[PDB]
Amino acid sequence: NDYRVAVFGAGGVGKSSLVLRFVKGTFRESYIPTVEDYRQVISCDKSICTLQITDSKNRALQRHVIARGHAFILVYSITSRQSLEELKPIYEQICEIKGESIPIMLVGNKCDESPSREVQSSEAEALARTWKCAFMETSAKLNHNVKELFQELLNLE
């Protein structure tokens, strides 16, 4: 019943906003400039066993999080192609450290703002095909397939 995830993405894309809505079902909109931030670690000891999740965005502890981790989420904002570009160094960083059989997921969060949609799902799906990983578009605000994401991550055993 142990279940450990790892969430990656640029600042502000909504890693903790997705994890916080999968663990506690809550969401509360906020804004704060990146100069003030992010990094969160939320792990609630269930009852049967455990459920531990981490969001990462000087010190290169990303190497430690990846080496110790065993299932990764890559989050980019639909309204930011730059944030999608920042995930490729993280993918290569998870490939050099580990092995292929790793369960990886590419998430297009903040899909509720198609008026600001910079990344069309075509460009992203091609990348998911070339990475041999799964891709889906979530929205922590409106709870669009947020549970359907972590469920698909829990299945991969």
Ligand X SMILES: Nc1nc2c(ncn2[C@@H]2O[C@H](COP(=O)(O)OP(=O)(O)O)[C@@H](O)[C@H]2O)c(=O)[nH]1
Q: Would you list which residues are annotated within the binding site for GTP?
A: 9-16, 28-34, 55-57, 109-112, 140-141
Nearest alpha carbon to residue 12 among 74, 68, 76:
76
Residue nearest to ligand X according to CB distances in the complex = 14
Which segment (11-19, 65-73, 100-108, 122-130) binds ligand X by CB under 6 A? 11-19
Q: Does 118 bind ligand X (CB under 6 A)?
A: no
- CA 19, CA 24: separation in Å to the nearest integer? 8
**100 class by beta-carbon count within 10 Å (0-12 exposed, 13-18 middle, 19+ buried):** exposed
**Contact with ligand X (CB under 6 A) among 8, 15, 84, 104:** 15
We find the least distance from the C-beta atom of residue 2 to ligand X, in angstroms, to be: 24
Candidates 29, 45, 96, 157: give the one binding ligand X (CB under 6 A): 29
Q: Which of 1, 26, 30, 58 binds ligand X (CB under 6 A)?
A: 30
| Dihedral, CA of residue 113, residue 123, residue 39 and residue 93, to nearest 10 | 180
Q: Torsions phi, psi of 44, nearest 5?
A: -115, 115
89 vs 129, beta carbon nearer ligand X: 89
